């Protein structure tokens, strides 16, 4: 029957399934079909002892961040306008700031779901759908949109503080350049391979620094969905290009402090001096903060489609897009635990909040994990 | 197999161009004068070496 339609080139799996510690779930509290195998920048936030849980279909939950029991739930699928009764279709993910849950929808609508009931305490349409989850801070709803437009909306009403185009690639070159405000400057990375800093006060470009290549005439990797969210360790911006090529660079000027411009990083955290990251082969590597000199590495998730690395229960936790969870050593790369709580996959960054670790799987939705 | 060409020719061809069609020059009387030759019709009459037909030299 199916011995003949065969044409596939290899992806490397997950080796080294070790449970030095035993993993588990803290509970399981599924939304529905949530983040989805559909590539979406919806992502649940965790705060207030409330699993502020959601899906692109419309169901805005609140589950308990103790056992996942319904604190409030609304369903906020769209209604009409040139076509009636759409699902919510969230472009930006869950941002719970204050008494609002700010979620960007793929209708370029950014909301503010009132954290007592998730009622839209304000809705504002933004400049294209949210390529980054809304970084809602300093009175601003800072969004890197699909067109790379830095929104800023008055987070009490969504009143637009500004909209400014960012580092702009040729298309939706898929990279979350999530606008972090650092030292009064909304520092952004870029899906056009550059890294900027823009003003947090009004959206004025502090600088822009080209890091490395984006797609087009230097055709680069389309597995490096880059963490162009900058983590400015106070004077030194840490962010990527669009190809993943890591650098360290100045806050005030963007002058390159150092770079790992060969390392096409996918996900990365500046974990002290020990930069834990996701390699281009989905592998895990610990780097220095001075040249990105490898402090340790791990190929036990070679091309196994990981989430971001996080430290929870003392060890480097990471999930994959295959439903597995991986407690990597914070030392040289050993699985201290492995939990397959799901098969539907994870691309959510694991939220080590409320004392717990809450994720939404793709359609095997919201799970809380511990060991 | 059988002796005609065994896999092969006696395919139709042509040879009439070496015969060089006899052409009697058109005469125009006075007042009937138009330029009787134009186009690529310019044949320098040269009986330099080789001959008519396949008696022209063949390499």
């Amino acid at each position: 029957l199916f011995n003949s339609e065969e044409d596939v080139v290899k992806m490397s799996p997950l080796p080294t399934v070790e449970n030095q510690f035993t993993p588990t779930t803290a509970w399981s509290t599924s939304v529905g079909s949530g983040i989805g195998n559909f590539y979406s920048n919806l992502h649940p936030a965790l705060a207030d002892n409330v699993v502020y849980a959601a899906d692109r279909a419309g169901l805005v939950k609140a589950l308990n961040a103790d056992d996942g029991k319904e604190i409030w739930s609304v369903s906020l699928a769209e209604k009409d306008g040139w076509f009636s009764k759409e699902p919510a279709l969230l472009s930006g993910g869950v941002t719970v700031s204050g008494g609002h849950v700010y979620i960007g929808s793929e209708k370029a609508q950014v909301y503010a779901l009132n954290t007592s009931d998730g009622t839209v305490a304000w809705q504002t349409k933004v400049a294209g759908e949210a390529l980054s989850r809304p970084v809602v801070s300093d009175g601003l709803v800072l969004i890197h949109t699909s067109n790379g437009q830095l929104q800023a909306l008055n987070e009490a009403d969504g009143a637009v503080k500004w909209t400014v185009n960012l580092d702009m690639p040729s298309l939706s070159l898929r990279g979350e350049s999530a606008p972090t405000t650092a030292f009064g400057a909304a520092v952004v990375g870029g899906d056009n391979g550059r890294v900027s800093a823009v003003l947090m006060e009004q959206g004025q470009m502090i600088w822009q620094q080209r890091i490395s290549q984006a797609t087009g005439s230097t055709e680069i990797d389309r597995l490096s969905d880059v963490d162009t969210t900058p983590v400015v360790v106070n004077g030194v911006v840490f962010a990527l290009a669009y190809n993943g090529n890591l650098t360290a660079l100045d806050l005030r000027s963007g002058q390159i402090m150092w770079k790992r411009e060969l390392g096409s990083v996918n996900d990365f955290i500046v974990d002290g001096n020990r930069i834990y990251l996701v390699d281009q082969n989905d592998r895990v590597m610990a780097l220095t903060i001075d040249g990105g000199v490898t402090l340790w590495t791990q190929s036990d998730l070679l091309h196994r489609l990981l989430t971001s690395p996080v430290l929870y229960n003392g060890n480097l936790v990471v999930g994959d897009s295959e439903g597995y969870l991986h407690w990597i050593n914070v030392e040289d790369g050993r699985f201290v635990a492995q939990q397959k709580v799901d098969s539907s996959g994870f691309q959510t960054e694991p939220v080590a909040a409320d004392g717990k670790l809450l994720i939404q799987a793709k359609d095997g939705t919201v799970y809380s994990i511990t060991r | 197999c059988s002796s005609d060409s065994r896999y092969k020719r006696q395919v139709s061809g042509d040879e009439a161009y070496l015969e060089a069609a006899p052409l009697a020059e058109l005469h125009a009387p006075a007042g009937m004068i138009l330029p009787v030759t134009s186009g690529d019709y310019a044949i320098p009459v040269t009986n330099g070496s080789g001959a008519v037909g396949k008696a022209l030299d063949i390499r």
Binding site: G128, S146, S172 | -
Partner: protein, 783 residues
Amino acid sequence: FVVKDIHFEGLQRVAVGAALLSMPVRTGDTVNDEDISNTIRALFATGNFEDVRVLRDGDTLLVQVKERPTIASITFSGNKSVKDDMLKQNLEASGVRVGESLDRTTIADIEKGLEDFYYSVGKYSASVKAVVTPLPRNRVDLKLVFQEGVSAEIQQINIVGNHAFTTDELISHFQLRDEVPWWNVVGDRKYQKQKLAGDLETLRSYYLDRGYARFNIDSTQVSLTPDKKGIYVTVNITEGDQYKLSGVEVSGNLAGHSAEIEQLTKIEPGELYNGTKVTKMEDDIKKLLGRYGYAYPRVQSMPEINDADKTVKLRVNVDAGNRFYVRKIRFEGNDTSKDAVLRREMRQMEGAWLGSDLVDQGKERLNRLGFFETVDTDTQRVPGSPDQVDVVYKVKERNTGSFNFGIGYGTESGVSFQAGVQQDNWLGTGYAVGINGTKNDYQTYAELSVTNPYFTVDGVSLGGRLFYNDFQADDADLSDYTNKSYGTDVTLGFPINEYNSLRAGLGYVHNSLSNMQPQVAMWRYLYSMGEHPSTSDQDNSFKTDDFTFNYGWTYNKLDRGYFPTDGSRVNLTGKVTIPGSDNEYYKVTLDTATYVPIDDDHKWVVLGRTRWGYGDGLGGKEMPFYENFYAGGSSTVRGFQSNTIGPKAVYFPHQASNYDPDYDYECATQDGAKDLCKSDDAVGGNAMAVASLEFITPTPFISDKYANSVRTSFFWDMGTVWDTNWDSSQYSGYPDYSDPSNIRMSAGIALQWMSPLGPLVFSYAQPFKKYDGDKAEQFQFNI
């Protein structure tokens, strides 16, 4: 240092001095230390030199050369979908091919560029390594190994900034379709960005025609989603508001055709704005002035879109040419037929004005020719006067000739055969020659059908047809129905309109029958002839010389004369007898073929093909039984066997057939099966009603170099033939066939494979419902 001898170590495609002239230093030139290193790069600037080691023996230069050139081959592996010549075109885009300089530096360059090509495919998960494999003296094979994982596909289209139209019906306007269900299976998928720009306008037009003259697209942003497959689109549009085309302000060089132009600007002032038909009405004048002699009718509209009342006004700038553009014409692609064969299928004359459509109907006449491959032209402006346009009718012709054969009696048994040949446009003349005939022991048939289609300049279609059958169906020479039949028909084509065209002919047939089978309705015709022969013997003879008057008429709007796909044409035919005929009768007939494109790219076209017939006597007589109606099998109705649709006659109670063969050729005879046995073959009626409904379907796997010459079509075959004179008295316990419920049913697909001597028809067809007396062959091929 001055060189005594430059030593050229290995060249292998280039010459010795051609390298030496490419050097900055010649053997004997002034030598500098830079010139030696310049000799390194300038021999590298030969491009055929892989390594170059310009050294010198004190001053005696010694140049060690390794070599790029002729690439021995270029090999390709893993090119499951992509043609390797396209991959070689990207090699040829890099200036690389077999037999060329191999630069070992640009290897990963092209390996990028083919993936950069794989990028532009709609993939990216397809990776190539170019492998250098050396051959003698300089040569190199270039293995190219393609590791093709997966393509990208239609996933999502978001149009933010859309505030008028539904994306779902918009995606239905587009071809960016992303659903083939499992229990509602329909449609297809697989993105290409070349579809995008067409579907960009499919958005834009669908705004434009509605009134949205302030519609625009802000931007469009396609996901470069990793997995190299995720294609989610952020379209940004300004949907605009709707506008009212509220008046045309057309003027310019209206060339005195202003009201005619005003007929083409008969608009509703205030209707919802539609620039598409506005664009069309611009062209309406352009053909109108193209009818009026103006091949360059510069028509420039101006939509004064008045946003103050949400309307549009319409200035249109008009600038015609000059009338007598048709100076002359040229005809190209005619190296096998005469020029006036093509020039007679035209409607515009040289030394005249331009009628734009006279070219086209003339080209439609050449489209209705059917000896062509292409119909086009080159409407060549001859520069100078605006009266010199010389239309160079470049077209492509096509082959003819087709032999027809049955299946088998010769070369093992006696010399007996079936033949039928076609020579249409006989040797580039237009002459349609169609000749058939068969000489067996059971028959000796001959037939010709030759046509001078243009015997006069109207298209007097001198269609002469002859036949001479020495038919026996012999037991020995004659015991069972030997009938020599012979005669002629010369039939002529008449201009009636440019599609309407009549037919009229005359009939000589002398049948000379003998030893006839005792079939009742067959002999009921004889008793309708007042001829009452011996029902229990086959000795009975008949000499008829029937004299008929044939006729008919055709309409023809059917586009390709040889590979017809759209249009509709009528074929009325018929015949009637005259005073002097041995039997007074008629026969009326018509056949249909409709061509309605389901897909309007015509890969799906409705084909409904029916055939009609009625023939009886003119009063006091009867149609002869050899003029009955037949269908079923290897035909327009197939899945059956041949002659399986119609009435079914019964033998008279019979004895010796004057040599009935001993327990062979039974006719209720002496030799078994006595006393009103019934034959179950279709003997046919006085009425025909037969149809065939077929469905144009493409072939994906066949290369469209030669899939375009191939038409696959599923069908249903169904029809009925009965006799209104068929009584259910003799045919009481025997089946009666005075019914329109004599229907048969079949289905299947035909296979039109075009050989170099014509299309070859094959069909495994399946008889679904069989009426009485049907016999079936499933796999049936029309040669």
